Each structure stands twice: as structure tokens, then as C-alpha cells.
Scaffold this active site. Sequence first.
Site, PDB file in Angstrom:
ATOM      1  N   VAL B  50       0.822  -1.199   0.000  1.00  0.00           N
ATOM      2  CA  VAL B  50       0.000   0.000   0.000  1.00  0.00           C
ATOM      3  C   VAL B  50       0.858   1.252   0.000  1.00  0.00           C
ATOM      4  O   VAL B  50       0.874   1.998  -0.979  1.00  0.00           O
ATOM      5  CB  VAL B  50      -0.996   0.002   1.179  1.00  0.00           C
ATOM      6  CG1 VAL B  50      -1.776   1.275   1.182  1.00  0.00           C
ATOM      7  CG2 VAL B  50      -1.924  -1.178   1.078  1.00  0.00           C
ATOM      8  N   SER B  51       1.624   1.477   1.065  1.00  0.00           N
ATOM      9  CA  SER B  51       2.196   2.812   1.208  1.00  0.00           C
ATOM     10  C   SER B  51       3.390   2.838   2.152  1.00  0.00           C
ATOM     11  O   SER B  51       3.402   2.179   3.192  1.00  0.00           O
ATOM     12  CB  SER B  51       1.134   3.805   1.693  1.00  0.00           C
ATOM     13  OG  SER B  51       0.657   3.445   2.972  1.00  0.00           O
ATOM     14  N   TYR B  55       9.289   4.495   9.140  1.00  0.00           N
ATOM     15  CA  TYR B  55       9.602   3.297   9.907  1.00  0.00           C
ATOM     16  C   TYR B  55       8.996   2.060   9.283  1.00  0.00           C
ATOM     17  O   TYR B  55       9.534   0.960   9.441  1.00  0.00           O
ATOM     18  CB  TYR B  55       9.048   3.372  11.334  1.00  0.00           C
ATOM     19  CG  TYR B  55       9.414   4.558  12.198  1.00  0.00           C
ATOM     20  CD1 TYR B  55      10.465   5.403  11.885  1.00  0.00           C
ATOM     21  CD2 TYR B  55       8.679   4.833  13.335  1.00  0.00           C
ATOM     22  CE1 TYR B  55      10.762   6.486  12.667  1.00  0.00           C
ATOM     23  CE2 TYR B  55       8.977   5.907  14.133  1.00  0.00           C
ATOM     24  CZ  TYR B  55      10.022   6.730  13.794  1.00  0.00           C
ATOM     25  OH  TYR B  55      10.332   7.812  14.582  1.00  0.00           O
ATOM     26  N   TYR B  56       7.883   2.227   8.582  1.00  0.00           N
ATOM     27  CA  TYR B  56       6.950   1.140   8.362  1.00  0.00           C
ATOM     28  C   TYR B  56       6.360   1.229   6.967  1.00  0.00           C
ATOM     29  O   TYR B  56       6.305   2.298   6.359  1.00  0.00           O
ATOM     30  CB  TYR B  56       5.844   1.158   9.421  1.00  0.00           C
ATOM     31  CG  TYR B  56       5.125   2.471   9.574  1.00  0.00           C
ATOM     32  CD1 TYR B  56       5.565   3.409  10.485  1.00  0.00           C
ATOM     33  CD2 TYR B  56       3.996   2.759   8.838  1.00  0.00           C
ATOM     34  CE1 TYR B  56       4.920   4.603  10.640  1.00  0.00           C
ATOM     35  CE2 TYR B  56       3.344   3.948   8.990  1.00  0.00           C
ATOM     36  CZ  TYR B  56       3.812   4.865   9.892  1.00  0.00           C
ATOM     37  OH  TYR B  56       3.159   6.058  10.047  1.00  0.00           O
ATOM     38  N   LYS B  71       1.171  -4.130   8.835  1.00  0.00           N
ATOM     39  CA  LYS B  71       2.201  -3.113   8.951  1.00  0.00           C
ATOM     40  C   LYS B  71       3.498  -3.827   9.270  1.00  0.00           C
ATOM     41  O   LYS B  71       3.553  -4.599  10.227  1.00  0.00           O
ATOM     42  CB  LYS B  71       1.890  -2.111  10.056  1.00  0.00           C
ATOM     43  CG  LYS B  71       2.756  -0.888   9.980  1.00  0.00           C
ATOM     44  CD  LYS B  71       2.901  -0.187  11.315  1.00  0.00           C
ATOM     45  CE  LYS B  71       1.657   0.471  11.821  1.00  0.00           C
ATOM     46  NZ  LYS B  71       1.921   1.311  13.025  1.00  0.00           N
ATOM     47  N   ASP B 171       1.657  14.323  14.491  1.00  0.00           N
ATOM     48  CA  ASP B 171       1.504  14.388  13.041  1.00  0.00           C
ATOM     49  C   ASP B 171       0.234  13.638  12.632  1.00  0.00           C
ATOM     50  O   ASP B 171       0.243  12.429  12.403  1.00  0.00           O
ATOM     51  CB  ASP B 171       2.748  13.856  12.356  1.00  0.00           C
ATOM     52  CG  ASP B 171       3.247  12.577  12.968  1.00  0.00           C
ATOM     53  OD1 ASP B 171       2.646  12.112  13.954  1.00  0.00           O
ATOM     54  OD2 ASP B 171       4.256  12.053  12.469  1.00  0.00           O
TER      55      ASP B 171
END
EC number: 2.7.11.1
Lengths: 174, 327, 663
Positions: B50-51, B55-56, B71, B171
Amino acid sequence: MPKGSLENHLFRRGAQPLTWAIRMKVAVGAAKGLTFLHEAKSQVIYRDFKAANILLDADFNAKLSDFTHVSTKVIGTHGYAAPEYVATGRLTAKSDVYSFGVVLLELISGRRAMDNYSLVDWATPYLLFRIMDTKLGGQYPQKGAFTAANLALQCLNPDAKLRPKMSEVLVTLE
Amino acid sequence: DKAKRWFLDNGSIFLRELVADCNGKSIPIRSFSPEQILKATNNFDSSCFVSQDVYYKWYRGEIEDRSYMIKRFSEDEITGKRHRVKEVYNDIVLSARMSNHSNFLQLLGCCLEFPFPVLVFEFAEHGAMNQRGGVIVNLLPWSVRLKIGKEIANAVTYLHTAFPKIIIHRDVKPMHVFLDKNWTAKLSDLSFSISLPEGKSRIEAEWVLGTFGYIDPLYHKTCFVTEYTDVYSFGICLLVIITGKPAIMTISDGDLQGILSLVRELCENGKLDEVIDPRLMKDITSGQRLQVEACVVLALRCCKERDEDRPKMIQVAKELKQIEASL
Amino acid sequence: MVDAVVTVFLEKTLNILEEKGRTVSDYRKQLEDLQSELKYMQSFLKDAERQKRTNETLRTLVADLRELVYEAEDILVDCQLADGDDGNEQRSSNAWLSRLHPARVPLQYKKSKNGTDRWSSPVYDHTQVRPELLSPDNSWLLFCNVAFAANDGTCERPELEDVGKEIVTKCKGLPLTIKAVGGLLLCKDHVYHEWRRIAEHFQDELRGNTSETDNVMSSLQLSYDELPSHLKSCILTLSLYPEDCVIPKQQLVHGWIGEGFVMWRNGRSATESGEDCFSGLTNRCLIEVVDKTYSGTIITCKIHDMVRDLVIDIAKKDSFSNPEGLNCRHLGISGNFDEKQIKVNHKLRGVVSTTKTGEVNKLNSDLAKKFTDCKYLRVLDISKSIFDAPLSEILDEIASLQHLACLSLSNTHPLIQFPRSMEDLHNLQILDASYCQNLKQLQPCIVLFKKLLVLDMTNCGSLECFPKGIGSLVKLEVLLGFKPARSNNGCKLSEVKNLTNLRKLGLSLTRGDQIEEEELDSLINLSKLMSISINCYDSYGDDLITKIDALTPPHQLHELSLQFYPGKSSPSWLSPHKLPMLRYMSICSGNLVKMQEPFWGNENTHWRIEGLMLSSLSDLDMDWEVLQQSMPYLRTVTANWCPELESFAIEDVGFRGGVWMKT
């Protein structure tokens, strides 16, 4: 290391009485150095203009030296940074001009941008209200410092269309 | 293999951080095997990706009878920095403790034979909301934009209010806010969070962190994260919903534009009828351009420079849920 | 604690005499001639353990008497699970049967003049609130509020009130002392001369102190032993907790009931007597209540410092705890405080983990092996712990540990497998691994021992979800986390029909085929079932809620608590029409949009409940006055995170939960 930086002398924890009107001469020596440092080339942006890089020599010479997505922002860790080094990320010449304006606003006044409210929040209101510095006695009647104060006011403008520049900031100071 | 001592280490400090957070009174987590989760992620390299983030990496996955979002965590970007490894377990147990709201991206387990806890979640059917919208190859309508507005807002005020200690994650991008079949905003990755202690809502941030553009200039300029820190960074997170424009935005000349730079001068100039993502002008928007004007005045009022004049996230949640009254 | 242990001994014998499978011998007729003299002893042993105070010469003898009452019940335990030629212990008892009364010849005159409690059961929530010291006209009204507390603490017959002035004027009106001597004086309240007795018992110990920190230090050691000994043994084991940790009762109540400090014979078995003796012990104000649920059940509880060091030095003068000094009763492992490795000893009645709500006892692989070095270690609960090895092959030596009755391995991560050293244990009277998110298999050897009381596998997702025949056990009183299985797999609800003793049960439902069609009617004939709980945590397919809806509970209930339920309507069995005498209701995080009208159904039927929780759920739209006209009996409604609900009472029903008491 010759002597340490400006806050190693001015902010040396509420001590070390600075000088008469050569703090403006220290600042214009910094600008004289920085202009051929970063504008006599094709383009260099200094990336790091903060009072912890402006060191002092024996004759108080402010010769500047020793200076990609990054999450932990560090460039301009306090009010040295620009209002459009909040939203852009690109280091333009307005950022170095604006940090030069805030270190000039320091050197006429002697106050950092900490909080117990910052330097912009008190400079542009308190304007003649040119009774801002109270440590020195010979700070007021020099009266080229009102010209330099209006230079800092025109230098701390938020927009990047009516900027000063590091070359032509020497003209209004000398 | 060394996956066993990987489990013995990360389960150790996972249980440590979990019982230090919420007394060991957890949610039904359930573990997995690498033969399950690797076949889910299709060995980490596919279109079920996905994206990215720092970090992940969000993936899709599929265990037997059911897809999921997964994740991972990038081990190469964490394993040398101790603040990162003490931050990531705060992230996963804070999401685990936080799953008790129906508006966070709820947790289904965490898989620990890795070096770092590649953790499952539930399956929101759409992809990640990108810095415009739905990332699966296609636009998303207006009513779901205001719906994901207040369903970001009540989730982040669950971050601020719901506990003895209050926690910020500084954020709230629109990159994080995921999106299911029922078009709800299951906000995810409480992953850049500080936990500030009781009573006082004002702590000095020891580093200063997170997602340029979305900084909250007072936290930029003073280096202390506070009760108001998300109020700025939600507001343009509202505006990325509204204009459909990224925070790091260019117009033909080297990205000199944030949305907050555009709007507060475009208000008195353009009279607000150019900020509504004009590819959603094929929507009719008959009377509900008034709630557009109301929410963008709301966004600029919660993005201003004197933070004592900002609303707090309870007030922004109440106001942008009461601008629903067009219905 | 000499009075404390004789009752658990004689009640253990009163339980085990009725087996009569071993009668052709000599060492089974002598039990009645072992309890007859102890029934004679307990007529005077209570006052003997306070003439104990300010006298050394009883610590020479009756302390050894106390330490051999443990020996006497322990050899009886050895005769219980012998299953062989245990004929060597017929003279082991005779070694002290002819020797107790040579310590009673010194007990000839020190009186010179019942294992259960009556005042344990009704609880009276006494916590009403320089401010320490008060006037005798202000101390005494609050002392009547604490002390009498039955008629809301009033003054009926004035013969009891001048004495009601004379105790509290000795302690000068400092708060927690009048709290303690009010909490004692809940109990008897019968006649004057019993209060003359305890008034002199309060007067004599103040004749030699002359210090306010020594005037209140014992101001309640008399209210430590003027209370029935089965709860006197029950207060003293929470000395084993540090200075201001907040103690959870699902650790120490299980610690009581495991090694046997709580007695039951009259049907009401396990937790209904455990929280009974806890609620009695908090009527005496030794333990104060910290936290409530919606339902008013208690969760965690704390002590005061100047009474916890009282029970500490009672343990010091009791050979009980602080094992710096080996002759101590049972170990308390706390957070990184036992690097000394408290050694293997036979004395060692048990262990308990204790943390300060936020830490973890890191504890090495060697001292779990020191736990299994014991023989008679009847509680073994290592809760908030981490380990460098899995608990399977380090607790694999419990085969040498037969007479165990308690283990709560909750919140302890290396627990990937319950060990196969668990077949040949036969009491194991409780077990639970609650909130432990890693249990790959729960072994079918626990379908063998027919007496376990709690079985919490609650909020633990990873599980094959049970062994097969769980209805074969009958004595399950609380079973949290049932999780029915698939078709040719595991357990079913259709066999937990075979249970009848349950009170609080739990079950998580994921697919549709954990429940089953003819299995849907499996919870009608549960007789004393009291509070079904449900966590329908997942539903990938909608087949769960399509036929969950006729799982009827027992009509008798107290705390129905379903906490996810992914159906958008109500479950359509939650009604006054289908469950009349339910008291408490709680809906945690789900997505149920509205409810059926058969949720309310108020043509003649109303809820008759008392508390309600609607916690964190982004779905509802109900009205407050509708909830008044539908639920006429309420104390509180704790609803905190639920929007589209703002027609309700409290100031932000979407964001902050006013619990909304009724005036």
C-alpha cells in the site's frame, strides 16, 4: 576554537558586558563573510545560519565556518527558521536572510526566542517605542540603530517577494 | 532458527511496555506464524503493498478466508537508534490500548517471530488515503470527506482526552487515515506519539519531530510539544481534504507553497470559491458550499499563530460535527 | 496466627471425614480425637493470642503449636493423595497427640472463664470521603456513621453511647484509628458488657505508650484479633505487598481460596464466599476500596501504611513473611527484589507475585525451578512476569508438585504451551491464564480433575479454543473465555449444558460455526448462573449474528456484559421479557446502530436492572427520557464515548463520561 560563539559571549548566562557599537560591526563582518561564502558562487544556501555557528576572534571577527526527507527536523531549532521553512522544505536565500535578521534582532536587543511570545511576537508590536534594550546605556542614543531596527523589521517580513538580500543588507548598515 | 529468540526478546519488551501503559489489561491480540503472514504479504514485494513511511510499510495481506492490512517495520532504519526502538513499542501498544474506540484502525494481533513486530490489523476495504484520496486505481465524494473530517477529529480527541495521562501524536497527516467499505475513517499508526505526564499539558519535546508542512510552527519554533500541537497539524489535515492539494505543493517554481500560505491571503482576495478541489466541482454542492466555507474558516482559525486563540480538539470536533446540519 | 490455622485444619478434617474409603486402620478414628480437643482449644485460644501480647512465655510454646498445626494438616494432605500404603503416619500424629496438652498445662488458667462469619456478608461502603484531628463532638458523629452503619449509623438505645464516647476519647480523634475501631464495632453491637470488655482491651494497651505514633500503632492490633480467625488469617497475607501498590483481588482472593483460607460447605462454594470474606474484611476497614465498575463489583484495593507495617511486624512476630529470615510462611516475589534466591525449604506454603501497577518482575529461569523444588506450595501465581525461556519446559516439573490448588499465570508472555506435566495433578482447584495473548494450545489433560472453580481464559485471542469435553466437569463456578469450537473439533456449547454450577462465564465468538443450530439453545437450564459475558470480537462473515439471536441466557442474571457484538441491531434476546432479574448491563465497543423494539418491550415488562454501561461505540441513537421510561431502576449509567447520543444527560456523552448518579 578562538573564543566561542555569540551566545558564548552575550548569553554567557547573564554576564560579560558586550561592547559599544561594534556588535553591528561584528554583524556586518558576518555578512561580509557570508556574501562571498554563499553568493559569489553560482548559488549556495548556508543551511545552518544560527548564533551557535557565528564565532568570535580576538578582534571580534565573525568569520563564519563549519556550516532528502528528514522527519526529526533540526534546521532552525528555534526562531532562527523562516515562516516558509515551515511549509516548504526547500532552503532558499530567504531562510538565510531571515536568520540573519533574527540574529541582528538579537544583537540590537539581547533576547532569545524562548518561552517561560517569541522575538517576532514582540519586535513588530513594540515600535517611537525604540526603548527595547535595557542592559546598555549607550544603546539608545546611537540612532543608526533605529535604521538597523527598521532594517530588521523589513528583513523579518514573512513573504518572499519583498525580501532584502545578503549583499544589500550591508548598505543600510554602513 | 533465531526467530525463537526474536520472539523471546520482542515479547518481553512488548509485555513490558503494554503492562507499563495499561496495567496488562489488554485487548484480544492473537499471534501468527511466518507461514501465514508471509503468504499474506506475498513476501513483502507485490502490488498488495500500500504505502511507505519512515519506519513502516503498509501492506495488504490475506490469511485464510480473510484479507487484512499489515504493517511491517523497517529493521534497517530502526535497529541502531534506541529512541526508535523505545518508540515503536509505544506505537504498537498505544494502538493496541487505543483499539477500544470504533474509529481507530483496530488491531487483530501482532506477529513476533520477526526481528520487529510486523503486526496485523483489521481490513479496511479501500486503501490508504494518500495526500489526495483513495489510492486504489480509480476520487471520493463530498459527504465522505466531511465524514472523515469528524472521524479524524473525534479519534484525535480520544488521543488527547481519554486517559489519566494525555498523549499527543504530533503528526495527523491525511496520509495515515485509512478507509473501509462503510466509508469510515479508521485512523491508524499512533506512531509518533509522546506520552506526557499527568496534570500539566506542556512538556519540552526532547527531540522535535514529524512530517514537514505539518509541524505546528510553535512546536517548530519553541521545541515543546503541547496540548495545542495537533490543532495546527489537524487544520491543514482538514485542508488537504478540502483543496485536494499537498502541503509540499509547487506551482511551476520550486514548492514555495503551503495551503495555509494560500488560503489566508486567498480569503479576502478570492472570496473562498476556489479552494474546494475543483475536480469536485462536478458535484452539485447546492447549499453545502456554506459548510465548506465554515470548515475552511474553522481550519484557518485553528491554524493561526497565537495558540491561545486556537480551539482545542474537543471544540473543533464539536463544531465540525455540528456543521453536519445541512442534512 | 495460632487461632487462624486451627480453623482451616479442623474444617479440612470436617470435609475429608466423609470419604470413609480408609476405615480399617487406626489413624482415621483419631481425627475426631484430634478435633475434639481443638474445639476445646478455640474456646480460649482467641484471648490466648492477646494475652500473648506483653508476654514472652507463650511465644515459647504456642508458636510451635501453630507451626505444628501446619504439620498436622500437611500429613492429612499426605494421607489424602497417598493412594497407597500410608501406614507410617499413624504414629506421626501420635508424636503430638500426646504432646499438645503438655502445652495446655501452661494454658490452665489464662482464660479462667465457629470457623465462619455472620457479619461478613452485608457490605456497607464506609468510605464517606488540621483535618486529621477532630473534636469529640465532631469525631463521634462520623464514628457513629462508620461504627453502627446499619441504621445509617444512628443512636437508638443510649446505653451504648457513653461507652461510645469513652473509646474515641482515648485515641484523641485521629481519623483512621476511629475508622478501625468503628469497623470492628460493626459486628457485635449486642450488649454493654461486650463493649466494656473491648473498652478495657483498648484501655490497657494505651497505658504504656505516651506517643501518638505509638498510641495508634496498636490502637488496632486489638482490632486485628477481635475478629474471626478465618479472616484474621486473611488480612495478614496482604502484608506481602509493597508500600502503596494497589492490590487486585483476582490475585489475592485466588491466593486465599487456593491454599484454603476460605471455608465452604453449604452449597455456596467459591467466589461467593471469597468476595464474602473480602467484603467482610473491608467492613472492618482494614482494607479500603479503590475502584468500582459500573456494577459496583470491586477490582483493586489498597491499605494504609501505618497498618501495613502493623501486619508486617505481626508477620515478624508470627514467622510468616519478610523472608530475610528463613522461617516464613509463603514467599512474595516482587519486582526485582528477590535476587537473593530465597532458598528451597519445606515450610513454603506458597508464593505470590506483587507489582506496583506498572512494573514487571524480571525473574530468571532458576527460581521457577526453585518453585518446583517445593512439595506443598499450594498457591503459585507469577503474574506480571517476563522470562528468558518458555513456561512450558520450565514449569514441566509440577509432576513432583501434586497438591497444588492455584495458579494464575496471567500477563506472562512465554506461555506458548501449558505443560504436559499437568495430567497427574488432581486438586488444582483454580486456574486461569487471563489476558495472556499467547496460548497456542490448551491441553486436554484438564478434563480429568473434576473440581476446578475458576477458568478464565479471558481476552486471549490466540487459542485453539478448548479441549473437547468440558461438560464432564461439574464444579466450574466461573468460566471466562469459553470459545466454542468447530464441527469435528474441540468443545461445544451443547456440552456446557452439562454444567450447572457456573456464575460468571465468558465466551468469544468469531465465525458463525463456533455456535451451531441445535447448539443455540444451550443456556437455559443453568441453575445458579449469574453473569454471562460475551466478547464477539471478530466477524468476517455476517453468519455469526444471523443466528446468534436465539442464544437465550438463564433468566436469572446479575451482570450481562457483551462487549463487542458486531451486529447492527440488538441481539434480540436482551429484554425484560426474556431475562427478568438481571441487575447490570454493559455494552462496550461495537457498531450496533439501533436496537429492536423487543429490547425495551414495556407493555408490562421493565428491566429491573440497576446499572448500565454504554462505553465506546460510534453507532447509537437513543434518548434519555426513553431510557427513563424503559429502565425505572437505576443507580448510574456510565456512558463515555458515544456520539449521535447527545440527547442523553451527561455533559459530553461522546467524549467524557459522567456516570450520572441518581439523587
